Structure 1
Amino acid sequence: GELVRTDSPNFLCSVLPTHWRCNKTLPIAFKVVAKGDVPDGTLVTVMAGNDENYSAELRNATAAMKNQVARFNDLRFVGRSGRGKSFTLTITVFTNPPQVATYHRAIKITVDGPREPRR
């Protein structure tokens, strides 16, 4: 369903808009997909930050794996990434031990989100 590679060889995730409004529901639900086998019920978590914001505030950043798919119901980014800057996503699959997959320049979050020029 249009997935993308993460920085880990074992996980892919759905496509995220390049620019979005803080606290606004995403255009397409976020999903983390495991390549290799991962036990149903396994918790998946999402975090975000960068040089301007070490830890962005997030909403509903927790999901559970089911048939290789962790589907986040209404993930939202509340913290902002800064003018021209994107967030680095850290996906964590709590297996034993925990597996982490990052995703650089994942998304830019501002107060307005994308807006047409003004005049």
Structure 2
Amino acid sequence: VLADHPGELVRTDSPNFLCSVLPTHWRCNKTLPIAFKVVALGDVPDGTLVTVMAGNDENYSAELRNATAAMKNQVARFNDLRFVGRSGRGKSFTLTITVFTNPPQVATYHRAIKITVDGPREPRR
């Protein structure tokens, strides 16, 4: 057929997973500009659950929404993943991506995204 969907990917801190590129700065509770995806390099059975958690040295555990997804063809696509918790001025969250195989495989993505109440804003006066 056509073939073409993972999008823009970056390495995670794990040698077994890549994930979508996230905006550097985004608004809290706001739908992301792309749909967050986790791509597995090594074989991973379909249906394996994948979750996202976030934290940093200021918010030890950020509140998220729709942070669970399932692997289908090596790709776990999140529908509407959102960051609700704030990360702190000049700071960004460290993500924890967990792929539930036995045992689970975990991949972090450091300084992945800064979440603020307003999100990116044009200077203003």
The TM-score by the shorter chain falls in which range?
Answer: over 0.9
Unaligned runs of 5+ in 1: none
Alignment partners' CA distance in 2, 1:21 and 1:109: 6
Q: Alignment partner for residue 76 of structure 2, among 70, 75, 80? A: 70
**What RMSD, in angstroms, separates the aligned Cα atoms of the two structures?**
0.5
1:13 aligns to what? 19
Alpha-carbon shift at residue 78 of structure 1 (Å): 0.1
Q: 2: distance between equivalents of 1:49 and 1:118? A: 30
Partner in structure 2 of residue 31 of structure 1 = 37
TM-score (norm 2): 0.94
User: Match for residue 86 of structure 1?
Assistant: 92
TM-score by length of 1: 0.99
Q: Aligned with 2:101: secondary structure?
A: coil
Structure 1 residue 89 displacement after superposition? 0.2
Give % identity.
99
Structure 1 residues 45-76: Cα deviation after superposition (integer angstroms, max 9, x where no partner) = 00000010000000000000000000000000
Match of 2:113 in 1: 107
**Other structure's SS at 1:53 match:** coil
SS at match of 1:95: coil
Tell me the residue number matched to 2:103.
97
| 1:28-54 CA-partner distances (Å, limit 9, x unpaired) | 000000000000000000000001000
Partner Cα separation in structure 1 for residue 110 and residue 8 of structure 2: 18
The number of residues matched between the two structures is 119
Q: Cα deviation per residue 1:62-116 (whole Å; 9 max; x = unaligned)?
A: 0000000000000000000000000000000000000000000000000000000
Q: State the 1:118 CA deviation.
A: 1.3
> CA shift at 1:2, angstroms?
1.7
2:23 is paired with a residue whose SS is: coil
* Structure 1 stretches of 4+ moved >2 Å: none
Q: Deviations over 1:6-47 (max 9, x none)?
A: 000000000100000000000000000000000000000000
